[PDB]
């Protein structure tokens, strides 16, 4: 009937819709696989981890379009985030979509952890899928994140070679206004040392997991995670003026929720 639904035991009347109704999905998490396509597909369909999408390094094309693998209906959670925290939330699996990108990650080469560049074909395939996802759920720019952002002590992915600024120019994810980063730099050289505690407060509020008593090591991983995303020219995890100014400009533009 007119807005009425039948069931075993009861009728539902759907005629009155509440104003306060919002997606359960709020977060888009970017990963790399650190493994080849067939191997990643095997792993992400097994019983320990999964993701909603798997993008090959160079997706095959059909009907003039890159093909991407969907492993898990978006309505359902995938096992991609693990133990995690972002902007007040935990258990990020519950509220996120996870995209896995076939990419080798890091390999230590004479002690120097070297990351692998992202195939431009892959990024090109990613853009329309991210846009559709972001439209569908009205995902806010600051909630397009790296796995490292939501689990900084455990993960680096997708790493400092991931083109966040390029994506931001396509309307995908958060990026600070350059004039405001300069404003907050406030006359300092970019690498001028800044007070670690003060920087960590800002990162906490922007959304990073920061606990009251952390070893220097653990404080470095948080700052490093932030730099890999937002200041990838140097991601050694030391608090400096440029890192702080970026955090300050991000907070000004996107807030904290």
């Amino acid at each position: 009937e007119k807005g009425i639904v039948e069931k075993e035991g009861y009728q539902l009347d759907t005629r009155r819709q509440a104003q306060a109704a919002y997606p359960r999905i709020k977060v888009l998490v970017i990963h790399y696989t650190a493994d080849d396509f067939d191997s990643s597909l095997a792993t992400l369909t097994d019983k320990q981890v999964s993701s909603h999408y798997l993008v090959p390094a160079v997706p095959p094309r059909y009907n003039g379009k890159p093909r991407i693998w969907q492993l898990v209906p978006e309505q359902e959670l995938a096992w991609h985030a693990g133990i995690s925290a972002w902007r007040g939330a935990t258990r990020l699996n519950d509220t996120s979509i996870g995209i896995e990108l076939e990419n080798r990650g890091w390999q230590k080469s004479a002690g120097v952890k070297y990351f692998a560049p992202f195939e431009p074909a892959q990024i090109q395939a990613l853009i329309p899928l991210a846009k559709d996802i972001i439209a569908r759920y009205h995902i806010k720019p600051e909630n397009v994140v790296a796995h490292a952002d939501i689990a900084p002590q455990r993960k680096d992915d997708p790493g400092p070679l991931f083109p966040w600024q390029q994506l931001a120019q396509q309307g995908i994810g958060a990026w600070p206004d350059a004039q405001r980063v300069n404003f907050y730099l406030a006359g300092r050289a970019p690498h001028t040392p800044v007070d670690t505690a003060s920087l960590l407060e800002l990162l906490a509020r922007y959304g990073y997991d920061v606990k009251p008593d952390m070893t220097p090591r653990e404080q470095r991983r948080v700052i490093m995670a932030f730099q890999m995303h937002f200041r990838p020219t140097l991601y050694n995890g030391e608090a400096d003026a440029e890192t702080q100014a970026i955090a300050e400009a991000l907070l000004e533009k996107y807030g904290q929720d």
Binding site: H31, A34, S51, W79, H80, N93, D157
Partner: peptide, 4 residues
């Protein structure tokens, strides 16, 4: 990467 991934990773319940």
């Amino acid at each position: 990467x991934a990773x319940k």
